Every structure is written in C-alpha cells, then in structure tokens.
Amino acid sequence: REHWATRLGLILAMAGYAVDLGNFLRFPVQAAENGGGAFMIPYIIAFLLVGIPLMWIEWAMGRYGGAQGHGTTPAIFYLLWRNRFAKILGVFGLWIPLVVASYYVYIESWTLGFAIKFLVGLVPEPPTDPDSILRPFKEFLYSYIGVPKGDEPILKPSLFAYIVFLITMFINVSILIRGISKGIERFAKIAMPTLFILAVFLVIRVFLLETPNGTAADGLNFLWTPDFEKLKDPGVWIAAVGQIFFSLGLGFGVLITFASYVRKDQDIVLSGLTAATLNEKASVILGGSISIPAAVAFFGVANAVAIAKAGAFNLGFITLPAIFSQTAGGTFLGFLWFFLLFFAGLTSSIAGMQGMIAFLEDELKLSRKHAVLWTAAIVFFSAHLVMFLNKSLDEMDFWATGIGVVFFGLTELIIFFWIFGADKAWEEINRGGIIKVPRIYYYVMRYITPAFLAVLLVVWAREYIPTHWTVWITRFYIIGLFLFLTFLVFLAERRRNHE
Numbered sequence: 001r002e003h004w005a006t007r008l009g010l011i012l013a014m015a016g017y018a019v020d021l022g023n024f025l026r027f028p029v030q031a032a033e034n035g036g037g038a039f040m041i042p043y044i045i046a047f048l049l050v051g052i053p054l055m056w057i058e059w060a061m062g063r064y065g066g067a068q069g070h071g072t073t074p075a076i077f078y079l080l081w082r083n084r085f086a087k088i089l090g091v092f093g094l095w096i097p098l099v100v101a102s103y104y105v106y107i108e109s110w111t112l113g114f115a116i117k118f119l120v121g122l123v124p125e126p127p128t129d130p131d132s133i134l135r136p137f138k139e140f141l142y143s144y145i146g147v148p149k150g151d152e153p154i155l156k157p158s159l160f161a162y163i164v165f166l167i168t169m170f171i172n173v174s175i176l177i178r179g180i181s182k183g184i185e186r187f188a189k190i191a192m193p194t195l196f197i198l199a200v201f202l203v204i205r206v207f208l209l210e211t212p213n214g215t216a217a218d219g220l221n222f223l224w225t226p227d228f229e230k231l232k233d234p235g236v237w238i239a240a241v242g243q244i245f246f247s248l249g250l251g252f253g254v255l256i257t258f259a260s261y262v263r264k265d266q267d268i269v270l271s272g273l274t275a276a277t278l279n280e281k282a283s284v285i286l287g288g289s290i291s292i293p294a295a296v297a298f299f300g301v302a303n304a305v306a307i308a309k310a311g312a313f314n315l316g317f318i319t320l321p322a323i324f325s326q327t328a329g330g331t332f333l334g335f336l337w338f339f340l341l342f343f344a345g346l347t348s349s350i351a352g353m354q355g356m357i358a359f360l361e362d363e364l365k366l367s368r369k370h371a372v373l374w375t376a377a378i379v380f381f382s383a384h385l386v387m388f389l390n391k392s393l394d395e396m397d398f399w400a401t402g403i404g405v406v407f408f409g410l411t412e413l414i415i416f417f418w419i420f421g422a423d424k425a426w427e428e429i430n431r432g433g434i435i436k437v438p439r440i441y442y443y444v445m446r447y448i449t450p451a452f453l454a455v456l457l458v459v460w461a462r463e464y465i466p467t468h469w470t471v472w473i474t475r476f477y478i479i480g481l482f483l484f485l486t487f488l489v490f491l492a493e494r495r496r497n498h499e
C-alpha cells in the first residue's frame with residue numbers, strides 16, 4: 001500500500017486539503033455578519049468541541065482502515081461495525097466528495113481561466129460610481145459561466161471556460177496519476193509555500209491600499225471590532241459550528257482516505273492538530289486580511305455591511321476583480337489573486353478525488369492509472385450538469401455539503417465511538433502519538449461532540465425541510481450516483497467471496 005514519505009508532506013497535504021477558497025472568502029464573510037471579532041468566541045468553541053475531536057476521529061478511522069488495506073468508508077464502516085447497513089452508510093462518504101467534485105473542479109477551473117485572462121490583460125477596463133465599476137465585471141463573469149439571459153435555466157459557458165475546465169481536469173489527473181507521495185505529497189510541498197508567499201504578498205499590497213473612501217485599516221477595523229450583542233443569537237452559534245465543518249473539511253471522507261496512507265503506528269494526534277492549526281492561521285491571518293479589508297478600503301466602511309451580505313462568491317469574483325482594475329498594476333494583482341485561489345482549490349480537489357481512486361484500488365483492485373482515469377471520467381461527465389443546468393450546482397452543494405457532511409459526520413462518531421467502542425477507539429487515536437489527547441476529550445468525543453452535531457441536524461432540519469422543477473434533474477442524477485456506488489460496493493463484496 002502507498003504511504004506518505006515524510007511527516008512534513010503529510011501535514012502539508014492535509015493542510016492543503018483544508019486550505020481552500022473558504023479560507024479567503026467564506027470565512028471572512030461569516031465573521032463580518034456574525035459579530036466580527038465576537039464571532040471568534042463561538043468559532044473557537046466549535047473548534048475545540050467539534051472540529052478537533054472529529055478531526056482526530058477521522059484520522060483514527062483512516063489509519064485503522066489503511067493498515068488493513070482499505071481507505072474508504074464502505075469498507076471501514078464494515079470493519080468498525082460488521083453490519084450490512086454499515087456498508088451502505090459508508091457509501092455516503094464515497095458519494096459526498098464525488099458530488100462536490102462534480103462542481104468544485106469546475107469552480108476551480110474558473111480561477112484558472114480568470115488568472116489567465118488577467119495575466120494577458122484580457123479583462124474589462126471601466127469606466128466614478130460603484131455600479132459603473134462593478135457592472136463591467138459582473139458581466140465579465142456571467143459571460144464566462146454563461147448565466148442565462150432568458151427565462152430558460154440553461155447555462156451557456158464560453159468555449160474558453162470549457163477549454164480551461166478540460167485543462168484543469170488534465171492538471172488534476174497529472175498529479176493524481178503519480179500517486180500519494182510522488183504526486184499529491186510532492187505537490188503539497190510546492191503548492192503550500194507558493195500559496196503562503198502569494199497570500200503574504202497580497203496582504204502587504206492590500207494594507208497599502210488608500211482610496212478617498214477609506215483604508216485597509218478600516219477593513220481590519222470593521223472586521224475585527226467585536227459585536228457581542230450578536231452572541232445571543234443561536235444562528236451565530238450555528239454558523240460557527242457549520243463553518244468549522246467547512247473549514248476543516250469534516251464529513252467528506254477525505255481525511256479518512258488520506259489518513260489511511262499513514263503507517264500503522266505513526267502519529268496522527270499531533271500531526272492532525274498541526275494541519276488543523278495551519279488551516280486556522282491561513283483563515284484568520286491571511287484570508288481575513290485580503291478580501292474584506294480591500295473591499296472596505298475601496299468602497300468605504302459605509303458599504304461594509306452591504307459588501308458582506310453580497311455573498312462570498314461576489315466578493316471574490318466580481319468585487320475584488322473590480323477593485324484591482326482601479327489600482328496601479330491591478331491587472332497583475334488580479335492574476336496573483338486568482339492564481340492564489342487556483343492552487344488553494346487544486347490542493348483540495350486532488351484530495352477529494354482520491355477517495356474514489358482509493359476505492360477502485362482497494363476494493364475493485366484497479367491499477368492506479370485505471371482508477372484515476374475512470375474517476376476523472378465520472379467527475380468530467382457529471383460536471384456537464386453543473387456546466388449547463390442553471391442552479392444544478394446549488395442543488396448538489398445543498399445535499400452534499402448541507403445534509404451530507406453533518407449527517408455523515410455524526411455517523412462517523414456513532415460508529416467509531418459508540419458502536420465500535422469508545423475505549424478501543426480512544427486507544428486507536430492515541431496509539432503511536434507523539435503527544436496524547438487530553439483525558440477530558442474522551443467525554444467531549446462521546447457526548448458533547450455528537451450533541452452539537454445532533455442540534456446542527458435538527459436546526460438544519462426545521463429550517464431546511466421546507467425551487468424550480470429542474471432541481472429534480474439534479475436530484476435524479478445524484479440519487480442515481482448513490483445507486484451506482486451501491487452497485488460497485490456490491491460488486492466489491494462479490495469479488496472478495498470468489499477469492
């Protein structure tokens with residue numbers, strides 16, 4: 001079985017997974033709308049009661065599984081719990097990241113395409129007034145995506161957008177086909193520093209931004225000024241717990257698959273805690289210092305609320321490109337920005353596609369080459385739904401990363417720490433550990449963590465159990481995908497009985 005070569009590379013691959021566009025866009029937006037600096041209170045609390053506990057558990061299940069030649073949850077859940085239902089629930093953790101891959105790789109391709117357009121200077125050049133500056137870029141994006149101009153829910157992405165998507169897919173395949181160490185790990189050792197340099201450079205450049213409307217200091221001010229009165233809102237406490245899931249990448253079955261390449265007695269306690277810390281530093285230090293401050297510096301702290309409510313996607317693909325076009329050498333600033341984003345996604349997308357690569361290897365005994373190609377073929381195919389069907393993307397993201405990760409996360413807890421046995425599990429976590437997990441965490445993992453997750457489930461339920469008919473197409477497809485994965489798992493166990 002493949003293994004990580006260096007302890008360092010392991011951490012950089014894991015942190016590479018967790019560090020994403022959410023660090024630079026999603027996290028800052030959430031913080032600004034939920035108490036600013038006061039949002040750190042329920043965020044840190046969720047990091048300690050939910051994030052860290054769940055993270056160690058996924059590392060634990062991963063390594064425990066990897067030692068027995070299985071990297072995915074259909075096999076692993078069966079090992080912790082020998083039921084038929086256990087294999088079935090495990091499919092979710094093979095299904096979730098595949099659904100995400102169907103739209104993520106595509107969104108990742110946008111950043112690549114934008115980065116190219118910005119580098120060669122093929123971008124709009126306005127003109128005055130905010131709507132007169134934003135609109136040329138709002139249109140720049142819509143022509144790339146192919147946002148419907150009529151009542152039809154049909155996207156018509158440009159030939160360039162589609163071609164970059166191909167190139168992007170090809171780039172993912174290139175790394176993945178070289179394997180865990182020589183491919184993913186080797187790239188993590190290059191990408192993560194390159195990422196850090198780009199972030200710092202942009203951070204410095206943003207702090208020097210001075211416009212008649214404001215400064216970057218005003219941005220860091222508006223963002224970090226604590227509004228404790230919002231801490232009374234449960235919704236803030238829910239947003240924090242949800243954000244932790246998103247920022248760390250819990251409930252996707254990726255950490256599990258990665259940790260299955262960790263050797264049987266190698267440390268997962270300190271290593272995981274480290275990669276988790278790298279991610280959080282990248283969020284609060286780098287991500288919170290670029291997007292929002294620049295937006296406030298140019299549009300004033302007066303629009304700082306409106307900017308935050310405009311959504312993370314607008315901030316990163318319309319607002320920030322528009323601000324750059326109005327700065328000295330801003331067209332190159334746009335390129336660094338998108339190239340920063342592109343790598344941040346590319347380190348995450350190779351990580352998410354590894355789960356399917358692992359399954360085909362471990363359970364269907366495919367060569368790494370075949371597993372990678374058939375995985376790419378599936379992800380490439382499904383993406384056409386995201387590319388051509390309007391709001392298809394939103395529907396996949398709702399199911400896969402709304403119900404999916406929070407439900408499947410709780411399923412990970414119960415199976416490992418309740419069914420498999422809390423005591424056996426606690427040993428499985430701490431075994432070979434450079435440092436040991438604090439004794440108090442045994443209670444958190446057993447009660448507090450699943451309590452929070454259950455509340456997030458019911459709170460999601462009541463609010464979200466309550467769209468155009470075309471969603472049924474996306475629902476039809478993702479349901480079908482689950483069925484198809486169920487079939488492969490079925491074929492996997494029929495092959496094993498023969499041998």
Ligand SMILES: CN(C)C[C@@H](c1ccc(O)cc1)C1(O)CCCCC1
Nearest residue numbers: 017018097100101104246249348352
């Ligand atoms: C949150 N992280 C770490 C990135 C993940 C993700 C999941 C959902 C989403 O909306 C964006 C990214 C992702 O890496 C999961 C595997 C498939 C690619 C995306």
Ligand code: NA
Nearest residue numbers: 018019247248
């Ligand atoms: Na993150």
Ligand code: NA
Nearest residue numbers: 016344347348
């Ligand atoms: Na990444």
